[model samples]
Structures are given as C-alpha cells and as structure tokens.
Target: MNYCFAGKTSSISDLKEVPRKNITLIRGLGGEVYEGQVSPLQVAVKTLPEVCSEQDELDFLMEALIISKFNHQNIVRCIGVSLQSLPRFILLELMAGGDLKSFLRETRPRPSSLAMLDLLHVARDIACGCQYLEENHFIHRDIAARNCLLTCPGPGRVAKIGDFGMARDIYRASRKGGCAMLPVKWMPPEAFMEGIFTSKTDTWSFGVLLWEIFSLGYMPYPSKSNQEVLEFVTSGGRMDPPKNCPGPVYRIMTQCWQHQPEDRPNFAIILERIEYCTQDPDVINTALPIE
Candidate 1:
C-alpha cells in the first residue's frame, strides 16, 4: 500500500496532547483538526478513525504520501504522519486563517469592496497550486473554495489548496466513468451526466470557484436543486458573471465552463490567462476598491 513516500514518518509519541479549545470538526471530510504541539514546534493535526478497514488505511496512506511529496507554497504542506499508530495522525503546518469557504461564508464582504488585485492574487494562488497538481498528472476531483485554505487571515488572504480526499492520478485511472461520488454544483455537465472525471473536469470546478470568489461566497446556481443543476447545465445553462466581476476574469471563468472538456484550458494555460489579467494595472487597481 505504500507509495514510497520518502518523507518524515512520525509517531503519536512525538505529538503532544491535542488542545481541547482548538479542535475543529471538518464537516465535508468528517474529521476533527487539532491545534497541538510537536517537539518545540506548534502544529495542526488530523487523525484517521481508530477503527478502519484495509481500504481506509490505503486511502489514508495514499493521501499522506501524495501530500508529503508536494513542494509548492500554494499547496498545504504535510509535515509527517504516524503510519502504524492507532488513530493514525497526519501533522501539517498550522494555517491561522482556516478554510477559505468558511471565511467567505462567515465574513461576507460588500460586493466590490475587495481590491481586484487581491481577488486575482487569490485566484492565481489557487491556479498555481492546481497547475502544480496538473503538471504532476494529478486530478483534484474537488477544486472549490471549500478545499482551499488560507495561510493567514486577511482581505488579502494567501490561498492554498488542501483536502486531498478526492484526488486521483489521471494516468493511473481510466479516462471516463466510475467516480464514487460527485459534488453537483461544482461539477461540469459532462461529469454530472456521465461519471467521467479528468483534469478538465477539475478545470470546470475551478471555474465555479472563480464564480464563488467574484460573488464573495454566493452558492453557485443559488435557487436550483442538484437535479435542476444537472438538467440546466446539460441543457447549456451557465451562471452569469457576478455583478461587478471584472470582464477579463469573467471571460476566463467562461472558458473554464466550456461544454467540451477539451475546450477548457489546462491549469497552466488558465494560470497564464490569470497572469495576463493581473498585468492590467487599471483592471487590478480600480476593479474593486479595497475597503
């Protein structure tokens, strides 16, 4: 089950007591993240359930292995793991800002209050992380804001992609069909109609993320049920750009939502386009006034 991780594998003995006050439940992934100390360093910790099957162990190991090898600032860093310990633990760098989705949800800012430069920077951070994953041939099945985390709390937050629970190696898997589950709103028409998933499908989800960012956390297709979302998207319905969303940014988002998977730019191309948007001083400086 090992993927030849080749990183620091620690043990429960190294991780001190989990601080009761700072333990936070992660709903989507069904785990409690803890604020704890390891040696002299303060760290964040997550533990797999004490009771688990062989497949659970393999999945846990796979995530740990994949994360351990990651070397990008825009991706959450895994420091080490306790492989053979009961209630297996994975240690990570403490992100003071928490998950981007919760922050956006709880701290809803006025429309157009955030500087467009900050918005584009956040989007670029995510694109950089996704590009890294894509270049390594990994497909992040879930690429929405919820999966993104902030290293520091601010209107100008530094976003990093986290939660690898649904990631897959594109070349290792088949081109189409057989996903265990799908996130309806974040999924593309093809992914919704057929269970086929690829890096391009992830590109589609990234588009939804852009929508979320520009709208300051509004749910995609706000009034529609999951069934309606599937039907509407398959019938060629696309979300209109958020009010006051910059034209170039909206255009990039639209490119991500193209019906044909091949029509969507790969993350590298997307990153380049986003970079292009950042280059326009007028678009960057005046699009959204910093409040």
Candidate 2:
C-alpha cells in the first residue's frame, strides 16, 4: 500500500519546517532541483509536483529506493524522502559547483578553464562511482556528465555521481520504455539497436562521457542527428579521439567502445587504467595547463 517502503527512510521527520528559500531553476536526477534550507543546512530538494498519475509517483519512489541504499563519497548522498506530506519530496546534499556539463561549457577554453589533471581526476571519480555500482550489482542507465555533479564552496571540491532516477538494480528485470526519449547520442550499438542493456552497455556510455569530459562538454557526434548516430554506430563507426586528448585517456575511451560488449573493459579495469595514468608524473608533466 505504501509502495513497499518498509524499513526505507521514507519520511520527513528530520527535516525542519523551515521555509524553503533560494529556490532556483536547476536540474538533476529526479527532475527540477532547488536549493532549500532544512534547519539551516543547504539541501537540494526534489519534490514531486501534483500527482497526475500513479506512474509518476512510482518513478519518484523508485529514485528514492535506489538512492537511499547508497553511501559513498563518489555518489550523491540522499538525505531522505517525504511520503506523508502534500507533494512528496526527496532531499539531497546541495552541490554548489553544480553539474559538470554547464561548468565545462561556461569555462570552455578560457585561461580559467578546468585543469587537465582535474579532468582525469573527475573521470576517475566517476569510474570510482561506477565501480561501486558494478560491485553492488546496480546499473546506472543514465551515465553522462550531465548527470554527474561537482561539490564546491568547501574544501577540496570533488566530483560525485548523482541522479539515480534512471538507475536499476541488476537483480530486477527491466523492459524497454520508449526509443524516442532515450539518450541515443551516448548509447551503444546493442542498446539502441536491440533495446538491450547490461553493465557493458554502461561501459559504452562511459566512453562517450570520457569524450565529453576531454572535449570540455562538447556534444558527441557533433551536429549529427539521432538517426545518423544510430546508423553510424550500428554500421561499425566509432567516434574519433577528442582533439588533443591524452593518449592514455583516449586509449581507455576507445577500449570502452569495443564492438563486442564482453571485449570492453569493466569499470574496475577502467579505474585501474585511469590510476596508472594519474599516478605517472611523466603523464602529468605532458598535460596542458588550466589556461
């Protein structure tokens, strides 16, 4: 009756009744996100708008279910969910640095642009989160820079994998929803062509995300339509390396794009490869400066 919420933290008991303020239009996993005050603590709130259908409520609850079980630095923290109130809400830690996509695009190619070293670190952080999910037998259906976030206005801002709205555990059976609304640009051949998804499918998107990170959030397959991307990928085409991308990083990207899903490196191997490059002083020495 209560969406199978037994033992789940589906309550607003801890949140103070303080008036939500500074609410602005920013987006994240569950939909529109807002910065709010809960007992003076900065929190990002995802509240379900007027319930128009049961499916909407189900999806919102699904997000809360997946997020509540996670506890890791590289993954976003879920404060709790509100099911006993008007317009149920999901609370999370506010990431002041915001989403990486806009941050990368805004500071694109400027003297203050993101550093080359941090790029690797951010990607590594993402892989760290992915490895956690892989180990936990969860599949992050949407793995993109747009879904990942950065924490800031505090000591040592770092990247965290946020937005579990589309995540699903491997133990559960999943089905195709709609092809039109899917993110085809970052999709693998099997996903769009066969409507199939697996951990390896995530590996493919990780490659595209790596491309996005290196290319400063540039759109994949620049100027190509969804149909074109589908035809290209299905026809054995792969994206060329991002301009000036480090050889080691680009190698991982290409490997992640292997034609056979089984041939792609798992997140564990991906993280290992990333660590190898990040630990090498010679690799760091040859990278471009932030400017």
Candidate 3:
C-alpha cells in the first residue's frame, strides 16, 4: 500500500533540519500542531503518531497527495510533508483565525464587525470548496465548521476547508464492520444505516454547519445522546431553523437534510441557492440574533 506520488515527496531529514527552537504549540484533527518558522515564513506543523497500520499509513500519504493537488481558493493548501520520519509531519499554511466553530463561538457576545452578508459568504465559501471537491470526484466525509479554517480575523476573512482525514474518493465504497469515531450528530440516516459515504452525506453535515453559523455555534441537537438523535431523526424530527434565520436560507438547509440521499442538493445547487438568498435585502442586511 505504498502511496507515493511524483512531486509529492519530501526528504524526512530536510523537515528535521528545520529550526525547532521557535516552535509554538497548536491543535489539529490528527493531533498536536506546532507553529514554527520555516525559513522565510511561519508554517503549521501537524504531527502524526510514530507508528500506524500499513493501511492507515497509506491513507495518510494518499490524503496528503490529494490535498497537494487541490487548487480551489476555499480549500486549504498543503505545504509539504515528512512521511519518512518516525513521527510524520505535515506542513500547512498558517490559518490565523483558527477553526470557524471557535470563531463563531467567540463572536457570540461581541459587537463584531462581521455582518450577515459576510456570514452568508462564509457559508457560500464552504459550498464552493465542497463543490470543487465534488467536481473532482472526492467526498469529504467530515464537512463541518470545525474543519473550516480562516485565513485571518475580521469581516473579510476567507474560509477554507482544512481537514481531509475523513475524505475519500467517491469511486470507492465505504468499509464496514468496525466502530469508528464518527460525527454522529452531523451524519445522515443512510450513512448510519448502510455505512455509505457520498457527496450527499457531506451535504447533510453542511446543513448542520449552517445551523451552527446561525446559532452562533450552538451544538446541534443540544442535549440529545447519539442514540437519541438517531431515533429522533428516524422518526421525522428535524432541527428547527435558528432564531433570525431567513426563510430562504432555512429552505436551503432543509434541502440539504432531505431523507433520501438523492433528494439532497449538490454543492453547486446549494451554492446557487445561497447566492439567490444573498440577493434579498432582508437576508443580507439583517443580523443573526446573538444567543
């Protein structure tokens, strides 16, 4: 399961030779991340465990190669990697504003400069990123605000999809039989029942992410246990639109959460719907109520 690709490999020793004295600790989906000076600029270093199963290692390398080929503005760029090292290292662009979930949470109390239009644009940015992946025949199994990273702080910040650990090629079917750490609250019914993975399921997660943005980062499903959520959704229950959520926007979210995978709107269609919503004066001019 060697996942080597031409123009994607880097010497392990070269990464090791970089100065470590100026490194600062950070966080990542895989594990601890570090902010370090890599020659002319700062880079975020994601460190993976020293050892893993052969399949897992191949997956990691493959993910790196996939990310390296991404050219969309809304998708995070991979700087480099040290796959040959004992503890593998992934270098990435420094996202100063961090994950979108924390950013929205922190904005809850403040009279922030971020406008409703900007927030909708963030949503659109995510849709565009997903659309790019979808067009390229990839499915991002984990599509949530927590995985969306910002280039910087303030109103005009750019949002980009940051993580790809759960991403898989659309051509491959999902594997079954083992309990995996899944984002249950964000998953659609078919994904839980059939162990299926598709662009549509990612749309389902995007619906939950829309709720997060409008709610100013409230947890989806509140106090419900994973089992409870499954039962609730299966029995026709669904999350209501957030307070101050515009009607058209909520309509888009509902489409993303449709029961049948075929019923869910693709990212391109979702992006178009979002663009239409943005044109309404009421949708853009008004602000989301702070919870």
Candidate 4:
C-alpha cells in the first residue's frame, strides 16, 4: 500500500519524540532519524528523506543493514525493518541511557563519578563490536561518542556503535580501498588526504572517542569549528586532551591520534591498555590535587 506517513510526519515538530530525544535525532549517519515508543517496547525508527540523493539513500539503508546483522550483548538489538514505502526504515532497540552526547551533557561535572570505569566499559564494548566488524572487514569509519550509546541492562554496562551511516564494508565479492571522507576532526590524516577507509581508520576515530570520554564529551578543540579542524591537524595540533586525563589514559588517546592510521593500536591492544590504566591507579603519571 504505498501510502506516505504524511500526517505522522507533519505532526512531528522535532527530530524525535521527547521520550526518545536522547535515543534518536536528525543527525548521525548523516540523515534524519526518530526513536519512539511503539507500545510494549521503545524502538529506534530511522527515516531517509526523499531529498537525499539516491546514492546516499542507498548507502544509509545499507549501513542500517550492516548494523542489523550483528547481535551482541552490548550492541543494540535490531528488531527488523519495514520496507513497504519508498524510503526504507529500520527498527532498533532503545537505549534508555541515550546517546553518549546527551548522557555526557546530563552527567556534567566530570560526566560521572564512575567516569573512569564507565568509559572503560564503553571502550571495551565498542572494541568488541568493532572486532566483529573488523573480523569481517567492515570499518565503522564514523566512530564517535555521539554515535555510540550506553546501555544499563543490569551488571554489565554495554556500548553499542549505532549510526553506521559512514561505515563501509571493505570486504565483499572483491576488495576495494576507497571511501568518501567524513568530518575531518574525527578522521585520520590519510583519511583527510585520500578518500580512504579502513579498520585502522576506525581505530583512529576510537582514539578521538577516548578523548571525548576523558573530557566528559567535550569537543577536542573548543576554539575550532568543524571546517577548521583539519587545518589544525595539518598544523600538527592534535587534540590536547584534558589535563586531568590520567597519564596512561592520555597516552593511549594520543597514540590513537597518531598522524598515520597504520600507527594506531588495534582494538585488542587498546582494550588491554584501558583495562590496565583503570585497574592500576598507581601507574597513573598525572598527579591529582589533594582535596
């Protein structure tokens, strides 16, 4: 029945429902999205407007499909999809905790008393998720705190990397080595110079995500806008992560921001470093003030 959801569309004033504000938005993956309560359960419903170029629309849907293929305790569950209409949409699990951006904004003044532990959990979960993607040669090129979400489902705090809009499936019938670059700030040097995407590129963004986590989700360079970020990067100005960032934490983050994507550590090593940094406070080189 190719009926358009016009009434529902016009009736909506915001990017998403109030209850789902933190759960969804018109951003991420470079398209408009919405999260709502579909009765018994809350589901993230994403829409690709007709205005988007045919290629972009296809890319967006394929990204959603990629996200849907994986099932992890940390990764948000993909309920399925409904493609009756022109623009396709996918239904996904709802994270009450919201996206990392909102959660960080809400938990100001250090972002969380459990900042260290909480972020460690986030990194670990995403690392595992990336592991699955990497195993199959998929690169989540857009890895950011905003794209990831925190889940509170009992003992284990989970991290799910949603908004796979910019992610690329590097392995298919034949291997390809080219992909469009996204936001420069979140991208690596090779990414900026060449239209390239790799699991290592994902690793580079992982470092930036770590910086966001360390700074309680603060922008890496507060003074610069998105356009100016690459210039700064070209000038050798890396994200000087917060001073309060524990020494080991800062080290890992800086390592993640290495100019060459190949120089960055793999997810496994990153996870190990994070676990070690969190567990052994004594190894912290940054000195904290006495209260």
Candidate 5:
C-alpha cells in the first residue's frame, strides 16, 4: 500500500535516488543510516553490509516491512526499503532529535515538570502502540530504550518505537504449542523463558523501560555489562528508579517485575496506576540510594 502523507513537500526524493554515494551517514546498531532524497522529499536510508547473507538481509527487510505496515501513532513508520542492494536500506521518518538514548544523554537530570508531563504522554502513546502490536499478534522481542524514539520537541509528543527486526509474530495458541522465547530479566517471566508472552508481557517490558526513563539510561543496577544486569535482576537485586519516580510508579514497577508473567498487570492497569501517582501533587520524589 502507498502510505504517503498529505504534506506537499515530500521525503521521497532521496528514496527515488537509490545508493546516493555521499548520503549523510548516521551510525546505529546492525547498520548505518544515510540521509537521502526521492525527489522533493527527504528520508533516512539505512544501509547494511553486503557481506551479510541474503537470507539475513531478506529477514530484516521483511521485518522492517512488517513494522512499517503497523500504523500505530506511537510506532515509527517504515517508509521503504531496497533488498537487492549490497547494503540494504530501510527508509524511515527522521526524528530531528534522534533516539531516546541520545535525548537522555543530552539532557541529564531529566526534563522540567512540564517537560516530564510531555514525556509521560509520550510513554502512554508508546504503551498504546505496544497494545496495538500485541493485538495484531506481533511481539516486539526487544523493547528497550535504545529501540524507542522520541518525536518532535514539545509536550504530548508521541514516542515512536522502531527497530523491529527482532520482533516476532506469535499468538497465544502458538505459544502454548511449544516455543521457547529469549531470556531478559527486563522482560517478564512469560516473555522471558516460558514463551508466555501476551498483553501482560508488554507491560513487563514497559516497567523496565520506565526504569530506563527514570534513571536516564543508567543500566538497571548500574552495572557496565549485560551479565551484571541479568544476575542482578535474577538474584533479587531490584534496580531503583530515579529520584523523581513517584511511589505509585515504584509500585507499578514491582508489579511488572513480578516473577510470574500472569502476576503482571495489563497496560491499561499500568496507566491507571501511574495516573494515581501523577495526580498526587505531594507525591514523594524519592531516589533509592545508589550503592
């Protein structure tokens, strides 16, 4: 389907000109991005190496197509792609501010109260996007801060989720049929090893992502490596939220991180719980003492 926007100015110019040599490059995981044009339009062109096998490239390209087809407001729109090229390119909506990681790095101590309210709105939008994916039988295997992107600079801006090359399409019946999933403490129990992912599993990842937002990308438990985070979370070492994390937010986190995926609440429940914290003007901004 032709998913074009109403804006007279288009980003497709770069899309028209494939493999424009001097395309501005943006470094990212798996591949590098280039600023390209497809006539009266500008778009991001992601290119991966030729050495990568066709199967791998095709797999990722298909994944990008799947992600692009999802029209969730909070989900990043995948514009187009070229599969036969030496390095595949996946065009996407260019967010001037870059990713959530970059945003956190550039602005420490978090944004102001109004800014946070804006962020809160973005978070809700992201949750809604996840809800859409879950409803459509898609599982975002990786839902980390790095995988999420922020929209334009302003309040009520939606957080657009991207990088779905690892996303899987699994339904509850298929899950029960027998298929093991990955293990990440950040993911809920079902989402981790049990292959029990459902709407609730997304909530589990949302909790960890919340921790990421609150802690400003500080690795949960503050360790430098993945091993440390895995061990810390698996062994009962709960990562504390940032100073501004309201008490109700912590309660939500605790519920999300519950060992049992079934124990975790739904995304809607999470939203309501967070709202309870947000509505209270006197909520404590307690930061767990970093040890």
Candidate 6:
C-alpha cells in the first residue's frame, strides 16, 4: 500500500504561527524548527533550507513519512508535511521541553537537576520507542540524546525519540565513503567497518545516550574528537560510567555496548530492565548516593 500525504498537501499560510516572532524549538544544521498551530493543536514546523539539494526534500519526506506512521507515545507524532511551501515543512508535535541534549545540558549546575528516577523514566521512554522502531523493521541511525525530545524536564520528564534524519528500513550499507553526515561517537564497530545499520547498531547508540543522560548531556568522549572516538570504539574502548551512576542502570548501558551486535540486548530487553528500575524502590532508592 502506498502511504502518501498527497491529500493533505496545503500551505503554511493556513496554519497560524505564534505572535510577533516564530518561537524556535531546536535549531540545527539546515532547518529551523518552529512552534506553530494547526486549528486547535500545537505543532512543530521543521522547514528546509533555502538552498535545497536534490536529496534534501527526499530526506525530509523520509523523516516525515516514518514519523507519521508511528503510534507510540514515546515516538514524536507527525501532523503532516507541506511540500508546496517555499522551504517545505515536516510538521510534528511541539514537545514542550525541546530536544533532550539541550534540555539535559541546561539542567546541569542550574537549580534544576534530573533525579535518578527522572533519568530512569526518560531511558524507559526512549527504549519503548526504540523497541517500536526495531520491531517495525526500521533502523534509526541517529539515536543519541540529541534526537530525543521531551515534554518536560523534571520528575515527570517524558522523552520521545524524534529526528529520524538518518533512519532507514533495516527491512531494507558497506563503504569507504559515507553518504550525508554521521554520528560517529554513537556508532558501533559494524557500522564503521561494514557500513551498515541494524537494530543492534542502534542499541550501541542507546548505550551512549544513557551516558549523555546521566552525565547531564556532556559530549560523548569529550576529550576525544570525532575521529578519535571512531578509532577508540573500533579498538574495543568503552566509556566509563558517569560518576555515582547506579550500578543497575550502568549494567543495562554496558549490556547495550557489547562487542558483537548479536551479543547485545534489544530494546525489548532494555525496556524491561528500565521497567525494573522504575518500579522497585530498592533500585530507585539507589538515587540517594547516585546523586
């Protein structure tokens, strides 16, 4: 069956944007994401660059189509897309807390800090979304904290995986040269060597995202550059856990970072592990010194 939004094609003029200035959500690479509304509900408008490449629209549409089809609470909901518009657009849910990386980075040293339970919940939410993608036969090439968006950033922080910018169908690469950009730090060895992505490679990235969460969004391998991380990871190097990170939480993170892809647990298992952390006081209470 063809899944196209041809019937929904329309103009941004019809959608009411916010007053005075467009409220920016997350600014990155080419597009500037804005907070806008269509009728009653709030939505995010991710617009393309003025100088678009031939592949730019295709990439944006791929992201929109994949997101539009997802139904999980932990996956960002796609309202639709407006290709007719000047820069083009991929409309999404306006996550109140913006992107996870910036959110986590702000919390550090501020009056607000993420409690251990908060981190646990966010991890669980992301794992649920990741599992949904894996089960649906998709490979989300970029699963770092940067791609996860939040509804809020406190005890009730609700995290959802967004930015399917590099995603493709595992239901669908080896190479010396890569296409587009890459998240080298989050990649597993197979991805660099064989130039492929699978559910397993994503699991490896999930491991690193856990580090980002517990570290409060410090760049992965902060001392090491991109090329440095690429070399270190391929040479069997792994990052140390964040200071005072609970052993139980770190265990799951390490499990996700296994050498062989098959040896790593899927998001289904990761979700279950996080569930265990969420429900048990013995586990959650570890947050005491875990601070």
Q: How many pairs of residues in model 6 come into backbone collision?
A: 1
Q: In candidate 4, what are the lDDT values of residues 1-291, reduced to their tens digit? A: 011121232211211222322233333422455655454666667766778675555455455555556656656776655444545566677665678766666665532244456666677778787776776665677888888886653345577887665543331211333333446678887777786778888888888887877676677677888667878887778877564777787889888877777788887788788788868756343342221
State the C-alpha lDDT per candidate: 0.76, 0.76, 0.77, 0.64, 0.61, 0.75
**Where does candidate 3 clash, by residue pair?**
none
Tens digit per residue, CA lDDT, model 3, 98-153: 89999888876456676778789899999999998888767788888889999987
User: How far off is residue 281 in model 6, in Å?
Assistant: 3.4
Candidate 2 residue spans exceeding 4 A from truth: 1-31, 153-155, 168-177, 286-291
By TM-score, how accurate is candidate 5?
0.75
Model 2 lDDT tens row, 167-201? 54222333435567788988888887787888898
lDDT at 39 for candidate 5? 46
Displacement of residue 32 (Cα, Å) in model 2 is: 2.5
Clashing pairs in 1: none
Q: Write the per-residue lDDT of candidate 5 for residues 118-231, one digit (tens) a residue.
A: 445656667777777776656676677777877654453467786765552231112222223343645654444455656666777888888877666665555535556556
Estimate the lDDT of model 3: 0.77
- The residue-by-residue lDDT of candidate 1 on 1-291, one tens digit each, is 334223354333443333444334333322467776664656677777767666566566666767777788999988777555467777787777788777666555545345677778889999999888887767788899888988877765789998887663332242343444457999987777776888899899999999998877778998998888888998889999886777888999999999999999999899999999999875676554222
Residue 291 miss distance in model 2 (angstroms): 10
**Over 4 Å off, model 5:** 1-30, 110-114, 154-156, 168-185, 190-196, 224-232, 283-291
Q: Which stretches of candidate 6 lie over 4 Å from their true place?
A: 1-30, 109-113, 168-180, 280-282, 287-291
Question: Per-prediction RMSD in angstroms?
Answer: 5.5, 4.4, 4.2, 9.1, 7.0, 5.4
State candidate 4's TM-score.
0.74
**What TM-score against the true fold does each predicted structure earn?**
0.82, 0.84, 0.85, 0.74, 0.75, 0.82
Clashing pairs in 4: none
The deviation in Å at residue 32 for candidate 3 is 1.2
